[PDB]
Structure formats: structure tokens, C-alpha cells
Enzyme design. Structure first.
Site, PDB file in Angstrom:
ATOM      1  N   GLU A 104       0.819  -1.202   0.000  1.00  0.00           N
ATOM      2  CA  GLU A 104       0.000   0.000   0.000  1.00  0.00           C
ATOM      3  C   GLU A 104       0.862   1.265   0.000  1.00  0.00           C
ATOM      4  O   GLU A 104       0.555   2.228  -0.703  1.00  0.00           O
ATOM      5  CB  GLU A 104      -0.921   0.003   1.214  1.00  0.00           C
ATOM      6  N   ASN A 120      -7.917   8.656  -5.794  1.00  0.00           N
ATOM      7  CA  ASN A 120      -8.686   7.644  -6.508  1.00  0.00           C
ATOM      8  C   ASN A 120      -9.564   8.282  -7.582  1.00  0.00           C
ATOM      9  O   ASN A 120      -9.953   9.444  -7.465  1.00  0.00           O
ATOM     10  CB  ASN A 120      -9.560   6.834  -5.548  1.00  0.00           C
ATOM     11  N   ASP A 144     -12.562   8.166  -8.171  1.00  0.00           N
ATOM     12  CA  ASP A 144     -13.859   8.655  -7.709  1.00  0.00           C
ATOM     13  C   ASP A 144     -13.740   9.962  -6.941  1.00  0.00           C
ATOM     14  O   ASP A 144     -14.759  10.503  -6.509  1.00  0.00           O
ATOM     15  CB  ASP A 144     -14.576   7.583  -6.860  1.00  0.00           C
ATOM     16  N   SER A 200     -12.064  10.311  -4.072  1.00  0.00           N
ATOM     17  CA  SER A 200     -11.611  10.050  -2.718  1.00  0.00           C
ATOM     18  C   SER A 200     -10.088   9.942  -2.720  1.00  0.00           C
ATOM     19  O   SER A 200      -9.449   9.931  -3.767  1.00  0.00           O
ATOM     20  CB  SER A 200     -12.294   8.802  -2.164  1.00  0.00           C
ATOM     21  N   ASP A 215      -6.656   7.996  -0.576  1.00  0.00           N
ATOM     22  CA  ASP A 215      -6.145   7.009   0.382  1.00  0.00           C
ATOM     23  C   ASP A 215      -4.974   7.588   1.170  1.00  0.00           C
ATOM     24  O   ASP A 215      -4.128   8.277   0.607  1.00  0.00           O
ATOM     25  CB  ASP A 215      -5.660   5.736  -0.311  1.00  0.00           C
ATOM     26  N   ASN A 246      -9.149   4.941   2.951  1.00  0.00           N
ATOM     27  CA  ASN A 246      -9.893   5.756   1.990  1.00  0.00           C
ATOM     28  C   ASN A 246     -10.882   6.731   2.620  1.00  0.00           C
ATOM     29  O   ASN A 246     -11.569   6.411   3.593  1.00  0.00           O
ATOM     30  CB  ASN A 246     -10.624   4.794   1.042  1.00  0.00           C
TER      31      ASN A 246
END
Ligand SMILES: [Cl-]
Ligand SMILES: [Cl-]
EC number: 3.2.1.17
Length: 129
Positions: free
Chosen positions: A35, A46, A48, A50, A52, A59
Site C-alpha cells: 500500500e 482515486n 472517484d 476520494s 487514500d 480511503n
């Protein structure tokens, strides 16, 4: 902060992640490797909208508030910036809520694709724990 591998394993164990919901410590270290490459300041946007955050790339769609993810939730009740701290407490506590949400560690796509079904114990091999 960029942790060393065994340094992060020890911190995760200290905060109660070894065998949390049945996931051995190596699963968590493996997930953190892929990650964030063990970097608490990792962030990634991301498609969309959002973002992380942190060593386990938690998220903003569901788990933390960053003020710029429309329609999102903050189920860990934390600012996303708290997930970037050199102290991993907030990331660990939120990870415990995520992994209990029903799908286990499959909540982390990278765990499913790069750790699940592998020799995750290798990630803690040699560490003093
Ligand atoms: Cl393990
Ligand atoms: Cl992946």
C-alpha cells in the site's frame, strides 16, 4: 516516517494487530508494504475523487474526513491527516474497524492481489518480536 520492516511489525504488534480478526502479523506488514512501502505520509488520489492515506492507505470515501470527498462518510471519526502521523495509532485503530466490516482484509485490494495466498510469514521472518 518510513518504517523499517521489523520496526513496523513491532509497532503493529504493540498496537494489537497480530492475529486481529485472525490475520497474522505478516498479513498486515505485507499489506503495508504494497500500500505505502512503509511510508506513513503516503497519499494517493482515486478516480472517484476520494483519497487514500497513510501506511495502510485508508480511503476517505468511508473512513476519514478530508473535507473534499463529496457524499463520503467518516466512520473512524478522524481527520484523514491523522493517518499520516509517524505514530501509527490512528491508522491501526481505523484498520481494526475496517477489517471487522465483513470482508476481512479483502477490503485492501492490494492485500487480496499481492498478499493473499502467499507466504506472508516471510514479512516478519528474522524480526525480534
Ligand atoms: Cl505471519
Ligand atoms: Cl493490486
Amino acid at each position: 516516517k518510513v518504517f523499517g520492516r521489523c520496526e513496523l511489525a513491532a509497532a503493529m504488534k504493540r498496537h494489537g494487530l497480530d492475529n486481529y480478526r485472525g490475520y497474522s502479523l505478516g498479513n498486515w506488514v505485507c499489506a503495508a508494504k504494497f500500500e505505502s512501502n512503509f511510508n506513513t505520509q503516503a497519499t494517493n488520489r482515486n478516480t472517484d475523487g476520494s483519497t487514500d492515506y497513510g501506511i495502510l492507505q485508508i480511503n476517505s470515501r468511508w473512513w476519514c474526513n478530508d473535507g473534499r470527498t463529496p457524499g463520503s462518510r467518516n466512520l473512524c471519526n478522524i481527520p484523514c491527516s491523522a493517518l499520516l502521523s509517524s505514530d501509527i495509532t490512528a491508522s491501526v485503530n481505523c484498520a481494526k474497524k475496517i477489517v471487522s466490516d465483513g470482508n476481512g482484509m479483502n477490503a485492501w485490494v492490494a492485500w487480496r492481489n499481492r498478499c493473499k495466498g502467499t507466504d506472508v510469514q516471510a514479512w516478519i521472518r528474522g524480526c525480534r518480536l
